[PDB]
């Protein structure tokens, strides 16, 4: 058996990585003002009044889109709570909605269970509403948040992610988050924590420093924990990470399907095209990250059908593209091969549990795929055995037609990270043989999957 190299993912981190995609639902009182994305905590609760709320409709959207998990904003910075908390009146308890008899968080988790989706909770650390109170102190707010966190972590089923937005959260110190952390971990042991700034010792996943949907190239699962803390001074450390990082905290890539995070009818026309989403997929999931994609429910409490459709067509395109590994049926020759179990053909067998590996101390490998009939492809994907840490740190891919000269693929020359998944899109080539070059590493390669593909017409 192989020994792990450097730092390793936890079981939670493995589970989160497997999700590949997660949905954000930015929904609340901001939705009921005119073009507001950051509420001041002064809006009247009365204006909250979705006219046809149906979280099952949201799940339908995720189902068609292939998205196994969702995160709802139970409370944004504006302070308005989407469940009838016992610790505040600034909530659905006093909305016009259902005569103050409603609970959105309840309808969200219920629908999640009905559809077999993983439920996550966004609970805004910085709270503009509480700051309005003349009795506000960090110490008091700590206890307030704890209680709410307690409710959401206890009365609402299993919670797979808790999100801690860093905006306006600088005042919050590390022991505050420690109190909150104890509550989450104790009550929801499987819960992944997106943690920012002073929450850094508790974060299972990290921000990657932008909202364009673009993780770093490269993007290591590892980085220094202080990069999470001193955010505005470590862009590269959040976005690219660090191979010699003192912590295994992989990056989560958050992006909205619309220009804003909250819903605004004026943006019905600026919903991201299927192609844009494919790009963002390739610069997130295909960059050793996870794509957290936002769909804002409207004033009916529903996902706009353009948002749904585009996401669904993304799914369809991804399914076409990766439906056939064009490398299959190849004769496979490789230097540095550990054994029969670890044979390079395991990169093509579609088993979750098999992989190609090298010999101890040997970090390089050359693997040739000779194809029965020449193929055309404009896309490739590679996956590492992430339980064994970041092993390979430099890789390239070449192909050939004649069999004489090798041709470098520009977009796939001298790549560094592999991680959970790396995807490269390229100017379409025709090839009879494909060469996978493992050029460097901290250890011998462990590679689950390698494939080349033809991108779907949908894209």
Ligand X SMILES: O=[N+]([O-])c1ccccc1S[C@@H]1O[C@H](CO)[C@H](O)[C@H](O)[C@H]1O
- Picked from ligand X, its own copies, none, the partner binding residue 137 (CB below 5 to 8 A depending on kind) is none
Give 208's DSSP letter.
-
Identity of the residue, 203 or 274, whose beta carbon is nearer to its own copies in the bound complex: 274
* CA-based torsion, 110, 153, 74, 60: positive or negative: negative
- Picked from ligand X, its own copies, none, the partner binding residue 309 (CB below 5 to 8 A depending on kind) is its own copies
Helices vs strands, H then E, count in the chain: 9, 17
Identity of the residue, 167 or 265, whose beta carbon is nearer to ligand X in the bound complex: 167
- The answer to whether 216 and 241 are in contact (CB under 8 A) is yes
Residue 84: exposure state from Cβ atoms within 10 A (0-12, 13-18, ≥19): buried
Binding interface with its own copies (CB under 8 A): 51-52, 54, 57, 60-61, 64, 265, 268, 300, 302-306, 308-309, 312-313, 316, 319-320, 323, 457-458
For 219, other C-beta atoms within 10 Å of its C-beta total 25
b/e burial code for range 102-117 (CB count within 10 A of at least 16 → b): bbbbbbbbbbbeebeb
Place of tokens 């409207």: 298
Binding interface with ligand X (CB under 6 A): 165-167, 196-197, 207, 211, 231, 254
Identity of the residue, 257 or 444, whose beta carbon is nearer to ligand X in the bound complex: 257
What's the closest the beta carbon of residue 306 comes to its own copies, in angstroms? 7
What's the closest the beta carbon of residue 48 comes to ligand X, in angstroms? 23
Identity of the residue, 103 or 254, whose beta carbon is nearer to ligand X in the bound complex: 254
- Picked from ligand X, its own copies, none, the partner binding residue 196 (CB below 5 to 8 A depending on kind) is ligand X
- Picked from ligand X, its own copies, none, the partner binding residue 302 (CB below 5 to 8 A depending on kind) is its own copies
Structure-token pair, residue 428: 């379409």
What's the closest the beta carbon of residue 166 comes to ligand X, in angstroms? 2
Identity of the residue, 449 or 456, whose beta carbon is nearer to its own copies in the bound complex: 456
Q: Which residues pair with 402 in a beta bridge?
A: none
- Picked from its own copies, ligand X, none, the partner binding residue 207 (CB below 5 to 8 A depending on kind) is ligand X
What's the closest the beta carbon of residue 141 comes to ligand X, in angstroms? 18
- Picked from ligand X, its own copies, none, the partner binding residue 165 (CB below 5 to 8 A depending on kind) is ligand X
Could you give the CA distance from residue 29 to residue 44 in angstroms, rounded to a whole number? 9
Identity of the residue, 243 or 458, whose beta carbon is nearer to its own copies in the bound complex: 458
Backbone angles phi, psi at 393, to 5 degrees: -120, 5
- Picked from its own copies, ligand X, none, the partner binding residue 166 (CB below 5 to 8 A depending on kind) is ligand X
What's the closest the beta carbon of residue 26 comes to its own copies, in angstroms? 17
Place of tokens 């958050």: 254
Structure-token pair, residue 288: 């050793």
Could you give the CA distance from residue 60 to residue 353 in angstroms, rounded to a whole number? 31
Per-residue three-class SS string for 57-97: HHHHHHHHHCCCEEEEEEECCCCCECCCCCCCCCEHHHCCH
Identity of the residue, 111 or 227, whose beta carbon is nearer to its own copies in the bound complex: 111
Q: Which residues pair with 430 in a beta bridge?
A: 376
Whose CB is nearest to ligand X?
A: 166
What's the closest the beta carbon of residue 254 comes to ligand X, in angstroms? 5
Could you give the CA distance from residue 294 to residue 348 in angstroms, rounded to a whole number? 34
Alpha-carbon separation of residue 336 from 248, 358, 397 (angstroms)? 28, 5, 17
What's the closest the beta carbon of residue 123 comes to ligand X, in angstroms? 12
What's the closest the beta carbon of residue 349 comes to its own copies, in angstroms? 22
CA 378 to chain centroid, in Å, comes to: 25
Identity of the residue, 132 or 167, whose beta carbon is nearer to ligand X in the bound complex: 167
- The answer to whether 92 and 104 are in contact (CB under 8 A) is yes
What's the closest the beta carbon of residue 125 comes to ligand X, in angstroms? 9
- Picked from its own copies, ligand X, none, the partner binding residue 254 (CB below 5 to 8 A depending on kind) is ligand X
- Picked from its own copies, ligand X, none, the partner binding residue 336 (CB below 5 to 8 A depending on kind) is none
Identity of the residue, 26 or 338, whose beta carbon is nearer to ligand X in the bound complex: 26
């Amino acid at each position: 058996s192989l020994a792990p190299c450097g730092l390793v993912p936890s079981a939670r981190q493995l589970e989160w990585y497997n999700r590949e995609m997660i949905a954000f639902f930015h929904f609340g009182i901001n939705t009921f003002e005119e073009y507001v994305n950051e509420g001041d905590g002064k809006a009247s609760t009365a204006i909250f009044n979705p006219t046809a709320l149906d979280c099952r409709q949201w799940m339908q959207t995720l189902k068609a889109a292939g998205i196994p998990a969702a995160i709802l904003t139970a409370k944004h910075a504006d302070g308005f709570c989407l469940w009838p908390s016992k610790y505040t009146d600034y909530s659905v308890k006093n909305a016009a909605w259902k005569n103050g008899k409603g609970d959105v968080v309840r309808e969200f988790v219920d629908a999640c269970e009905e559809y077999g989706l993983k439920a996550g909770i966004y609970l805004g650390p910085h709270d503009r509403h509480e700051h309005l109170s003349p009795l506000y102190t960090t110490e008091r707010y700590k206890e307030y948040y704890a209680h709410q966190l307690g409710e959401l972590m206890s009365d609402y089923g299993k919670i797979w992610e808790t999100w801690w937005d860093g905006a306006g959260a600088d005042e919050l110190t590390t022991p505050v988050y420690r109190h909150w952390y104890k509550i989450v971990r104790e009550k929801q042991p499987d819960c992944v924590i997106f943690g920012t700034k002073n929450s850094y010792p508790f974060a299972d996943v990290r921000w990657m420093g932008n909202e364009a949907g673009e993780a770093g190239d490269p993007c290591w699962a590892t980085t220094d924990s202080v990069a999470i803390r001193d955010e505005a001074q470590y862009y590269k450390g959040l976005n690219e990470g660090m191979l010699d990082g003192d912590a295994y905290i992989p990056a989560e890539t958050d992006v909205s399907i619309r220009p804003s995070w909250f819903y605004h009818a004026e943006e019905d026309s600026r919903v991201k095209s299927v192609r844009e989403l494919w790009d963002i997929y390739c610069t997130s999931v295909g960059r050793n990250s996870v794509l957290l994609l936002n769909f804002p429910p409207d004033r009916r409490g529903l996902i706009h059908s353009t948002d749904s459709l585009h996401a669904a067509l993304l799914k369809q395109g991804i399914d076409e593209t990766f439906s056939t590994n064009l490398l299959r049926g190849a004769k496979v020759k490789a230097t540095n091969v550990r054994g029969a179990k670890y044979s390079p053909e395991k990169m093509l067998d579609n088993e979750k549990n098999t992989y190609f590996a090298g010999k101890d101390g040997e970090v390089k490998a050359d693997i040739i795929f000779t194809l029965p009939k020449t193929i055309e492809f404009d896309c490739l994907m590679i996956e590492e055995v992430i339980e064994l840490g970041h092993r390979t740190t430099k890789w390239s891919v070449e192909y050939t037609v004649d069999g004489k000269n090798w041709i470098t693929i520009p977009e796939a020359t001298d790549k560094q990270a592999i991680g959970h998944k790396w995807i490269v899109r390229l100017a379409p080539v025709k090839a009879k043989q494909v060469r996978l070059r493992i050029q460097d590493g901290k250890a011998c390669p462990a590679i689950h999957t390698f494939g080349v593909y033809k991108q779907s017409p949908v894209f």
